[PDB]
Structures are given as structure tokens and as C-alpha cells.
């Protein structure tokens, strides 16, 4: 994932 | 967990050149997730400073050539985790974005990561053990060289000896994320  | 999330952005040029960040960037920039904000400057008014404050309590801003706030420092060196990070808007780096000129500042500041802006072109690369980041313009604001500016910003995930840099770019009307890793 990505943090957003 | 033990991670420190740092938002890196700048050259918004609100409200002279743009009115707001892209709608799809604002959906991703929610409060309560980012620990620190490092901004390269050119906000250019207090309204955008207040907006950054809704995202994180710890906002760091250096003075861009169109900023209204003349209290912002010209440059700033901070430490996050194990990393010393330099921050400057970049209109002082001659010629613009030249890595030789950037490298001298790195040695002058003695930083592991040098953040600069002013070109409105995202770049993130490792060069002679050091890491160099330009987040581009988060609004895609036109430039004094322009040619098709792509809105972008950067998130650094700092944990132990590694920085995971995430690049968010608005390409077409879709957010493209790329990931680059740096180790001290």
C-alpha cells in the first residue's frame, strides 16, 4: 500500500 | 508503528496561480496521519499555511521568492529519526536544479537528504551517498519555464536506517504513486  | 511520516510539498502559488490543490490530492491528505510537514515555500499566503496546519501540528516552511511571509527562514536543517534533512526553496541554487550546485549545499549543511523546490519538476535521486528530493508543485502551478507542469508531492516514511519516499503525481486525472528507497 501507500499511507493514503 | 515506529514510522515517522513526513509530507514534502511546495510551490502551491495559492491564490495567484492556483486556487486549491487538486481534488484528488485533498482526498489523500487527511489530518492525523502525518507527523511533520517540510514545505519548500511559495504558499504564498497564510490561508495555505493554515491548511498545512490542519494536516499536522509540526509545519516547517522556508521562504520562497513569492511568499508573503518574510519571517520564514531562507533555509532550515532538521533531524528526523536518524536523518539530517536540509530544506531550501531553490531559487538560490544556480543554475536551477543543478546537482553540482545542490551538492555543495549538501556538504555545507552536512545533511543526509536535501529538499529543494523552485523548478516545479519532481525529482528524487541518490548521488554520492546522499539523497536529493524535489517534490515538484503540489498544485501544478505554472512556472517561469513551465512546459506542462504535473501536480505532485512526496511522502517520506522514515524508519530506522531507511527512507521510503512515495511520489504522488496527478497524470491525466489519475493519481500515480511511485516508491523510491534510500538507506543511510
Curated annotation (Swiss-Prot), chain A:
Subcellular location(s) of the protein: Early endosome membrane; Cell membrane
Superkingdom to which the source organism belongs: Eukaryota
SUBUNIT field: Component of the WASH core complex also described as WASH regulatory complex (SHRC) composed of WASH (WASHC1, WASH2P or WASH3P), WASHC2 (WASHC2A or WASHC2C), WASHC3, WASHC4 and WASHC5; in the complex interacts (via N-terminus) directly with WASHC1. The WASH core complex associates with the F-actin-capping protein dimer (formed by CAPZA1, CAPZA2 or CAPZA3 and CAPZB) in a transient or substoichiometric manner which was initially described as WASH complex. Interacts with VPS35; mediates the association with the retromer CSC complex. Interacts with FKBP15.
UniProt free text on domains: The LFa (leucine-phenylalanine-acidic) motif bind directly to VPS35 of retromer CSC; adjacent motifs can act cooperatively to bind multiple CSCs, although there is significant variability in the affinities of different motifs for retromer.
Miscellaneous section: In human, WASHC2 has undergone evolutionary duplication, with 2 highly homologous family members WASHC2A and WASHC2C.
UniProt function note: Acts at least in part as component of the WASH core complex whose assembly at the surface of endosomes inhibits WASH nucleation-promoting factor (NPF) activity in recruiting and activating the Arp2/3 complex to induce actin polymerization and is involved in the fission of tubules that serve as transport intermediates during endosome sorting. Mediates the recruitment of the WASH core complex to endosome membranes via binding to phospholipids and VPS35 of the retromer CSC.
Similarity comment: family membership: Belongs to the FAM21 family.
Protein name, per record: WASH complex subunit 2A
UniProtKB/Swiss-Prot annotation, chain B:
GO cellular component: cytosol; endosome membrane; retromer complex; retromer, cargo-selective complex
Membrane disposition: Peripheral membrane protein
Keyword Acetylation in annotation: yes
Cell compartments where the protein resides: Cytoplasm; Membrane; Endosome membrane
BP terms from Gene Ontology: endocytic recycling; Golgi to vacuole transport; protein transport; retrograde transport, endosome to Golgi
Transmembrane segments: none
Gene3D superfamilies named in the record: 3.60.21.10
CDD domains reported for this sequence: MPP_Vps29
Modified residue annotations for N6-acetyllysine: 53
UniProt effect for mutating residue 94 to S: Disrupts interaction with VPS35
UniProt KW keywords: Acetylation, Cytoplasm, Endosome, Membrane, Metal-binding, Protein transport, Transport, Zinc
MF term (GO), any: metal ion binding
Pfam families: Metallophos_2
Cystine residue pairs: none
Highest taxon of source: Eukaryota
Protein family according to the UniProt entry: Belongs to the VPS29 family.
Quaternary state and interactors: Component of the commander complex consisting of the CCC subcomplex and the retriever subcomplex. Component of the heterotrimeric retriever complex formed by VPS26C, VPS29 and VPS35L; within the complex interacts with VPS35L. Component of the heterotrimeric retromer cargo-selective complex (CSC), also described as vacuolar protein sorting subcomplex (VPS) formed by VPS26 (VPS26A or VPS26B), VPS29 and VPS35. The CSC has a highly elongated structure with VPS26 and VPS29 binding independently at opposite distal ends of VPS35 as central platform.
Free-text function comment from the UniProt entry: Component of the commander complex that is essential for endosomal recycling of transmembrane cargos; the commander complex is composed of the CCC subcomplex and the retriever subcomplex. Component of the retriever complex, which is a heterotrimeric complex related to retromer cargo-selective complex (CSC) and essential for retromer-independent retrieval and recycling of numerous cargos such as integrin alpha-5/beta-1 (ITGA5:ITGB1). Component of the retromer cargo-selective complex (CSC).
Classification via PANTHER family: VACUOLAR SORTING PROTEIN VPS29
NCBIfam families from the UniProt entry: yfcE
Protein's name in the database: Vacuolar protein sorting-associated protein 29
Organism (species): Mus musculus
Originating gene: Vps29
